[PDB]
Each structure stands twice: as structure tokens, then as C-alpha cells.
Amino acid sequence: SQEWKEYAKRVLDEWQPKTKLGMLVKEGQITDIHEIFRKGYQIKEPEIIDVLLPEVNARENQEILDIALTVRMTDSGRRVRFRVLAAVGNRDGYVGLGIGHGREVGIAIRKAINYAKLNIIEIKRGCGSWECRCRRPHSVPFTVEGKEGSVRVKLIPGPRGLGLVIGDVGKKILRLAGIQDVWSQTLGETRTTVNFAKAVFNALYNTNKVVVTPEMIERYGIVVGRAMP
RNA sequence: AUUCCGGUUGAUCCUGCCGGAGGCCACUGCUAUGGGGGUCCGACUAAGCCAUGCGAGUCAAGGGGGCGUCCCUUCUGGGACGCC
């Protein structure tokens, strides 16, 4: 944590904002990550996340989900292009997913990491399993669903210490968001990695669309964003 | 662990089947130091055919006999005892 404080301080001083939200962050009128959500702002400068969530630059908080090469046909042969699917998170409450293209692998990786920061979202965590009622944010608070392409994903709460009972892509994405235990069910073509990742991402996002009462927050130990001990 | 991964195109998304990865049972290649426990070993084809030995006896306190050893007298005998 000590490295990232000074890293954010270094980034803040030499950064020239170009947008309104960047100006708000630069002048110190916005000081917390949670204050840029749920008000319709547009996020176009990656430095905002670097200042407010510096730990997404750690090597352990980034994941290269997949790499593919695609071909365009021309009378002078085949033109090759790289597509990279990547994800980032702070392992507490925030996660982002991105896609980048480039003529060579390094450019595509850089752009994919860059776009993941701009698509960052915050989720809700809790414990809602029938056989584990512990009020601790180690799983999803209730059953959620998502879909993309032909892939349908359903996430079910699990007991503490169970593990992530899901394919590897889902494992990585859920780990980056700070979830330890879950059950799952799927339909469709999971071997299409992009759609699988997007479906898991949408299922995580849909935790904000479920109406809840103040009693439920106490009952399931629902936490929004950072756990904040 | 309420799970996926490879395969149809110059490249993409689907439907759909094949293969991989797990457990148990029967036969089998190569190779093997020790102990304990258990309801394991000619069932699948032939409920096909069988040399040899064994796998159902017991009762002397139900009854007349045979044989043997002893005691009493014994010509003769009567007892007791033990086998058949």
C-alpha cells in the first residue's frame, strides 16, 4: 500500500486533465473512488482510476484472459491482427473488463489494459447460502444471472471455504472482484471466451438491480464497494 | 468442485455429434519387501462328462446270542468284566 500512495502522488502532480471529471479529481473536490459512480458521469481519462485506485497497476491485480489472431483477406495476402481480452480489479469491490486490438501483441495488451480501467464497476457482496449464514462478504448475496451471445450464466451463493465452482475464466474474474465461494450453472457455448467473460461480468453487474430492504442488509451482511473493517 | 477443454472457416458466431479428463467391475502386458482385517476365487461358454477317497449316524439302562479274562464252588454251573 505504501508504494501505491507515492505512485498516486507522483501521477497526480504531472497530470494535465482534459475533461470535467479529471478537473474535479485534480483540484481535490473528489477524494474517494465511490464518488464517481451513480451520477451519469463519463469516464474518458485513465489517470482518474490511477489516482483513486492505484493498486490496479499491481501485477497480481491484472489478468490476461485470452489472446487471439484474426485474418483479413486481400489480393496481396493475409493481414493479421491481434485481439487481447484482459481484466483488472482491486480484489475488494471493483472490477473492469476490456478488449484491445493491435498490429503486434504488446500494443494490443497495452490497449486492452487501458480499456479495462475505463469500464470499471462496483458490486455488492454478502452471504446468502442456506447452509452458511455468517454475514461476511465472501460470496454473492443472492442468486444472479447474466448473458451474452449464446452464453447464459447463473451464480448461486456458496458456503465459506467451498471454493469457486466455475470455469477458469469465471474463476479469474470473480477472484479479481473479491469473491471466494460460489456455485454456478451455464448454458450455451462456453468455449467462446469473450462471451463467457462478458456474461460473468454482466451477472456481477446485475447485483445492483435487485431491490432490497434494510432488514436484508443486516441479514446477509451486504457490503457495497470496499469492506472497510 | 452444482466445472469444462480439442475438432467444420482465409477469419467469426451458432446448431450438432465425436474425442479427452473421473469412479467401479471382468480379462490381460511388465514388475513386486512386510504385517493385519473381511461376507473374495469353474457364476458368464458346457444344469457338459466323471477314475479314486471321504460328505449320516447313534443307543449295552429295549432283547436273546457268540468270544475272551477272572472269583466262588466247580464233573455240571453261577457270577463279574470287556469286545462283536
Ligand SMILES: [Mg+2]
Ligand atoms: Mg485487388
Ligand SMILES: [Mg+2]
Ligand atoms: Mg444479444
Ligand SMILES: [Mg+2]
Ligand atoms: Mg461451414
Ligand SMILES: [Mg+2]
Ligand atoms: Mg459347469
Ligand SMILES: [Zn+2]
Ligand atoms: Zn457464509
